[PDB]
From Swiss-Prot, chain B:
Membrane topology field: Multi-pass membrane protein
Main function: Proton-conducting pore forming subunit of the membrane integral V0 complex of vacuolar ATPase. V-ATPase is responsible for acidifying a variety of intracellular compartments in eukaryotic cells.
GO molecular function: proton-transporting ATPase activity, rotational mechanism
Superkingdom as given in the UniProt entry: Eukaryota
Site (described: Essential for proton translocation): 134
Transmembrane segments: 5-25, 48-68, 88-109, 122-147
Compartments, record wording: Vacuole membrane
Family the entry assigns: Belongs to the V-ATPase proteolipid subunit family.
Entry keyword Transmembrane: yes
Keywords, comma-separated and alphabetical: Hydrogen ion transport, Ion transport, Membrane, Transmembrane, Transmembrane helix, Transport, Vacuole
Name assigned to this protein: V-type proton ATPase subunit c1
Species whose genome carries this gene: Arabidopsis thaliana (Mouse-ear cress)
Amino acid sequence: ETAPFFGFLGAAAALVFSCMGAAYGTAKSGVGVASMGVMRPELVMKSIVPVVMAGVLGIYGLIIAVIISTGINPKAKSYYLFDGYAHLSSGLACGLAGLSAGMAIGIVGDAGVRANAQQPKLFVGMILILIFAEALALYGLIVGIILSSRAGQSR
Amino acid sequence: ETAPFFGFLGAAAALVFSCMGAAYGTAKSGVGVASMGVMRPELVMKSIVPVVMAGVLGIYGLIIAVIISTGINPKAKSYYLFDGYAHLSSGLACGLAGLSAGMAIGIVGDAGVRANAQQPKLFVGMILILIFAEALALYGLIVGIILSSRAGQSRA
Amino acid sequence: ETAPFFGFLGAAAALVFSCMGAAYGTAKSGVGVASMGVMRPELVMKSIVPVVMAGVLGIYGLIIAVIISTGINPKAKSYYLFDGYAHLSSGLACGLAGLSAGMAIGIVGDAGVRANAQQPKLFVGMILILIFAEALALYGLIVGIILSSRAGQSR
Amino acid sequence: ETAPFFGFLGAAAALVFSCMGAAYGTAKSGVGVASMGVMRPELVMKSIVPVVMAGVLGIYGLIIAVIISTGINPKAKSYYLFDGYAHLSSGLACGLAGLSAGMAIGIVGDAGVRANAQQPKLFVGMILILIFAEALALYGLIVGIILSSRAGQSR
Amino acid sequence: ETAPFFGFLGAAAALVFSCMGAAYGTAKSGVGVASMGVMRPELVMKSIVPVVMAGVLGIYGLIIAVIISTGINPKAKSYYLFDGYAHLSSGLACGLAGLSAGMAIGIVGDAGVRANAQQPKLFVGMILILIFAEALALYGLIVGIILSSRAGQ
Amino acid sequence: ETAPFFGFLGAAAALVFSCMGAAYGTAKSGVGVASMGVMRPELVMKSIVPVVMAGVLGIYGLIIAVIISTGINPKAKSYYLFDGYAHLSSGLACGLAGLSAGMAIGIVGDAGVRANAQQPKLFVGMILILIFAEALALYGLIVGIILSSRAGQSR
Amino acid sequence: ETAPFFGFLGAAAALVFSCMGAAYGTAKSGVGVASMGVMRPELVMKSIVPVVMAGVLGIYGLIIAVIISTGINPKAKSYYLFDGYAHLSSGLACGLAGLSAGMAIGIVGDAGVRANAQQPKLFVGMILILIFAEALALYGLIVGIILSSRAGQSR
Amino acid sequence: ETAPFFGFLGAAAALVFSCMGAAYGTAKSGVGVASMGVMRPELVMKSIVPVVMAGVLGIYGLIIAVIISTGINPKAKSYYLFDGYAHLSSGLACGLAGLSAGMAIGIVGDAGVRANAQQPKLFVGMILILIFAEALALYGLIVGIILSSRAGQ
Amino acid sequence: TAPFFGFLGAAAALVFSCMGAAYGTAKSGVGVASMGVMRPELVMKSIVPVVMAGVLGIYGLIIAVIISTGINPKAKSYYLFDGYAHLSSGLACGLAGLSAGMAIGIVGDAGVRANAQQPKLFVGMILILIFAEALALYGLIVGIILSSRAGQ
Amino acid sequence: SSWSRALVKISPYTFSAIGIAVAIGVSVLGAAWGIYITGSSLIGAAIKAPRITSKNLISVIFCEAVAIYGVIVAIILQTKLESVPASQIYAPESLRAGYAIFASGIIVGFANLVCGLCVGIIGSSCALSDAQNSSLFVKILVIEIFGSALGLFGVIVGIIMSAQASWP
Amino acid sequence: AMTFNIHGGYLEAIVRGYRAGLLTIVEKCTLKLVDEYKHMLPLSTFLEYITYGHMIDNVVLIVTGRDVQELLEKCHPLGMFDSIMRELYRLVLVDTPLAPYFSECITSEDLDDMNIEIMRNTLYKAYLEDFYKFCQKLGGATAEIMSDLLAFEADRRAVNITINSIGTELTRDDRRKLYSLYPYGHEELAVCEDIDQVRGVMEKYPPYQSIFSKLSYGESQMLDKAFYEEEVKRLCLAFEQQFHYGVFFAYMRLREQEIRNLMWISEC
């Protein structure tokens, strides 16, 4: 009866956690970018990338939430327990993974912003590190999407 | 029949969390601007921007709250049980997005106000960072609207 | 039914949270104003604005609580969970907004107290930020008005 | 039935919270007064004003709690949970407002006592600040009166 | 029914909390008095007063608890919920007020020990502050007494 | 049946809290006396008195606990449920009062050891201060005994 | 049955709490004992004694559990459960008394033995001080098991 | 019955825990690598073992989650509360073990970065240590795979 | 089963006591490292107490094995009173064992410091360690009494 | 009242699976913590020579032995699972078997984690000492062997507890 | 002490190795120690406080006023912190916790920091602020050792004041305040006005007691040489080298003591 309600709640919590992680990463990257711009305006332009990565992670979380919302359909099936359960599990997993990845990427970007100001060479490796960090969140989002695709639990 | 309590709770909570996040961000930005004061008094225009972003986040929160309140019409299409929970989910998403955006905006605005006094040429970068931050609040508002959209179909 | 336990609790909580937030903000502003007055009497005279903001927040919280209490008409209105729920939601929103506004007002008051000694133009500018915070609190209170008006559906 | 439990609990909570807030305010005011007297015993005489204000606020909270409690007469009216809930809400709100007001007023009074020891006009400034802080106690008393009226509104 | 059990528990909580607050305040005042006596024996004599003032709160709490215990009696009336709940709440309020007053009195006692070490008019102001704290404690005790006297049910 | 179990638990609380207070007193007094003996080994004997006072308080608490444990036989004394809970309350209150008195006595004993390092007149005064503090333990024990007797009165 | 369960729970709580407090005191005093022994081997022999005394007190507290194992007799007639709850309370009181007194004794003995490096007679003084509370700990621990054994009559 | 809910919750918890542990280890290792690379950028390019270990942890977590999800086939097996509870707990334990291993490995790599900055022998030693940690993580992954296989019965 | 869980906890509490004493063993080994930094003879002397502490945990494991051998519940039916008694006594023994392990670790650290210095009161340090081990053995023995205290 | 009677009922299969898996997980976590401590110690002393690295390798070998013991415990618990039919998962005998399995897992995993943490701390101190004094290596190996013996004792305890189940 | 195993093990091990490694020339040794600290850059806070004291010395050298920059360069970079006259003292107050108290004591900037007697009071205030910064480590055994060393320094300052600074007209209350928990209260050594009488009371202080012994060199000397033997004992306190604690400041003190011993040896 009320299980799809719990599923929708979990779907919303997914976007909530993704937004929280993205905001933390963005704040760290912004502090680093402010320090770099204080150092040299030239480094400021190259330092925008981590903020874009955090925003992309947030957008991915929002897209997952929108997909979950599309999953809820009264005409699809009558009140069913599994529909809420699978959706809530997928949302919780995706949100937790996104928040953790966002915090890690924020710390990494905060370090890298200071690092790049002294030496520009290490920026290449920092880019790869941030790419791997974002790819972890992308894999988590794909895993969550798999669970959302797992909708036809009954018959 | 007990769903409207949950719906009203979610509608209030969305606005409450959005206001809390906006207040935190605004306080951080104001402290940062006052610190940046005197040293670069001409940077009042730059210092105004984070307050504008916080106000925008607050307005988005109020809009989400108004939409949620409009969604609650028990006179037609009795709320049943899905309506209240859907309203609660939308309100929670909106409030959490608002709080996250407010915290990030406050931190970034403090950093930008600090950077304002020396080498103000990075005002464009600071504004870009603020816009990228407010993009999160915009996405949260969009998600809340999308969630509120599915509310009507749940009546059947 | 259970409406008094909800409505009365919400009405009390609104005033309690608003008073707590306003008190904390006013205490921070008063400490800053004392520092400014030690620095200069003119700054002490100028620093009155955060006290006005705190008083406005407290008055708004009290007004919201009064409206919620006036909403309680058990003789005219049949005992519905929705009627009490609307008042509880309005009270919770008002209290949370008041507490947040009080904390922000205290921070802004300390900042403006420092700025008044720093520069009169800085205090004049920070007045705008204080007004913006007060406007956010007023927006929360206004949303509280819509929440209170939603109680009309219950009779 | 169980309404007297809630009413008596609210009556006790009002007094307890008011006493805690008055204690905090009195402690802060006493610290400030001791500091001022060590600095200047003559100026210490005027420094007692914030302590008097905090004590007056605490007494007013206590008086409101006593008035609310005295209204509860089981022989006067039959068992109704509305009256007990209203009394409990009034007590909780009044106590919380009194506690917050007392703590904030004590902090502000200590700061203003230090400032008055510094400069004379700071005494008037701190008096104005405390008058501003009294708004929280005023709002708490108003909310308590409104809830006491709602208690009689039960039917 | 079983409400007088909760009422006796509340009276005991009143006594315990009042004693705890008063004794904490007395310990703080005693530390201050020891510091003053190390500083000046002239301050030592006056500094004893706050300890007795704090212990007065504990004595009053014990008296109130004894009165509340005397209140509970099956011969006086049959077991009931309202009277026991009211007695328990009155005891809780009195004990909380006494504990808060004792903590404030201890803080004021330390401050007044320092002030008396500073100047005599400072000691007079400290005495006034202690009087205000005692007045707050008395107000709390009176409120609790009235609430107990509201024992009709 | 609810009476004697509760009353025995209250006796347990009495013993526990009296022991905790005596523990605080003894630990603090011994810590102070250890430093005191280094300065003046002869003065160590004078500082031993607070330890004796703490031990006396603990012995009084143990005696009250044994007295409350006595009378557990249902046929021996009349014990209604509220009466046994009243005995529990008596025990708990006496124990807690003794605990607080013991902690205060320990703090005062450390202060008295410090004063013994100072002029011995301060130590003489601190002895009377410690006696006044210890009087609280006797008062609490008397109150607990009186309430336990009132609990013994039952029907 | 309920009474043997509560009685055994309290009897074991006696041993657990008494042993915990005794071991805490033993470690505390042993720190100072080791300090004094490292300072000089002459004081080492005198300072060794309090550690052994604390260990013996803990062993006695543990052994009291074996005695209390016969205090409650499930094989015997089952009386009202309140008697077993009384045994539980007696055991808990004994354990708390042992814990508190042993902790106090060891806390004092820490500084007592540590300061014994300066004066060898300080070792004797510390031994006396530690014993003054260790005896109370052991006495309370034994008295609790004794009361648990005795109160099992239940009229 | 409610078994699919338990199994889905367990799989989600496994994935979330593995992701969080991998993120923490990767953050620590990346911070260490960035700190070490400041002195000599040449050594920084060699410092890719943190990236490799983070990718390995993420891939292991994703594979475990996918395997658990595949096990949820209501059409094939009606399932039971016992089977779902077993599968969920097994997956969650595998994810927790992977998270702990990744966090510890990242903590080690944080200092290993500075060690590599010191000398290449410390670099190869840290490489060996990270290899041992990755072997422990792979053992946990294999345990999770075996546990998922058991869920089939 | 509730009685099965009670007896199992009665044994696992002493097991956890041994596991906690393993922490004191670790502290003793940590101190032994610094002690042997001075002289290898002191290294061996301090290392021996760590081996003894590990042997204590091995003995706890043997006790757990005996408990597992006796774990069969068909022989004896335990009621609420029996299960509560077993669990409480086991928990008390485990708390005593953990406290003894902590004290043993502290004494081992002190003895490691002494061995780092000259011998001096090495006999006294060994006596303190023996007292800690005696407390642990007393707890282990008290466990057996509660283990045998079963039946009607 | 009603809640007290309800709290008794439980599903034994979930408890059996928890005993099978959580013990291995906790052992893995403890081994990871010990390995991290050893790696930090090795990073501290990597300046001088890799003899301390060999000692840390011995400690890592002990941790891997603990992990292998956990894997063996998991395999046994897979085998030690009683018949426990899906229909017959409510008998009190099944509850007793589940309680015994949970006790075995708790005794195994917690002791394994404690031994792993102890081994990690001892190995860190030993690596520091070996870096300090070149002669002192056998003493460090003694502590490492003690930790390994503790882990082996935990493994033997699990092996003994393997035969516990009584479920239908 | 499992927190060391959980985190910070590698840095602590490196610091311990650097400490055990060390058992004109003094300037070179101090510069090498500073380079080791920079390479390294809990125990970190203690090392920071030790560097703060060593930088209070260089700031007092710099707050006054002569090739001052060359003199600072000759000093160790740990002693002469790169981050760092009334303006000079005010700038030194930033990034150095010890400097602001020295500036407060030196009301006339360089004039109130004259190397004869006034610089002694300025450096005493700087050391008091550095001791406050050390106390900002939230206590500990190393904090106890630092408190004992500060008490020894305060006793030495009071003894030197009573010996010579009475002629310098430093007020007895001010000199006691100039001579600084344990350092704060030294009334026993300030009770005796006479230099011979005050020397015994200063030696009665536990930091000075049992260390100075005959004290042919030490307590008789002025400035802060009364506790010279106690300083060597505190160096021997680090010789315990107990692990799992914060002893980076102890390592720096041992390195400084080794440098001082090498300087005292000089030729042959």
